[PDB]
Amino acid sequence: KLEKALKAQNDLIWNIKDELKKVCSTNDLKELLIFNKQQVPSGESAILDRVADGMVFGALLPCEECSGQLVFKSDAYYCTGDVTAWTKCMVKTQTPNRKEWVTPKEFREISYLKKLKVKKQDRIFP
Ligand SMILES: [Zn+2]
């Protein structure tokens, strides 16, 4: 039933993208990626796809290894925190510590996405 599994992950991912579309449009879509510092032509259509993916499977939250915050970029995620008066933690993982990420007002409502189908899907990493 490996085939059935694949079709279930694909369908959950797509239903998710539709939902966010309702909460975020071409304009709101672009707003989210821009706060993330990204403006791409292969964007907004990519904004729905890659975003839904980041929410469910893995957008970066605090590390608290370093009592820090994970700030990442595509294909290099760096966590910086303060843990000691002379010691901090920096973690270099392509994918950041996966938790529910930062999403604008509208997108913020996304909390059901992950729980539904949160498999380790692909993020904005080319
Ligand atoms: Zn850290």
Q: Tell me, what CATH number does 82's domain have? A: 3.90.640.80
| Residue 24 labelled as part of a binding site | no
What is the distance in A from the centroid of ligand 1 to the CA of 31? 28
Q: Are 81 and 89 in contact (CB under 8 A)?
A: yes
**Which strand (E) or helix (H) includes residue 10?**
helix 2-23
| Residue 66 labelled as part of a binding site | yes
* Residue corresponding to tokens 């950041």: 96
Question: What is the spatial distance between Cα 5 and Cα 28, in angstroms, rounded to a whole number?
Answer: 32
Residue 93 token pair: 């993982």
**Domain span at residue 120?**
1-126
* Residues facing residue 71 across a β-bridge: 78
What is the distance in A from the centroid of ligand 1 to the CA of 6? 34
Number of folded domains that form the chain? 1
What is the distance in A from the centroid of ligand 1 to the CA of 73? 15
Method: NMR
Dihedral angle at the C-alpha atoms of 82, 88, 92, 95, nearest 10 degrees? -30
What is the distance in A from the centroid of ligand 1 to the CA of 82? 8
Residue 104 token pair: 């604008």
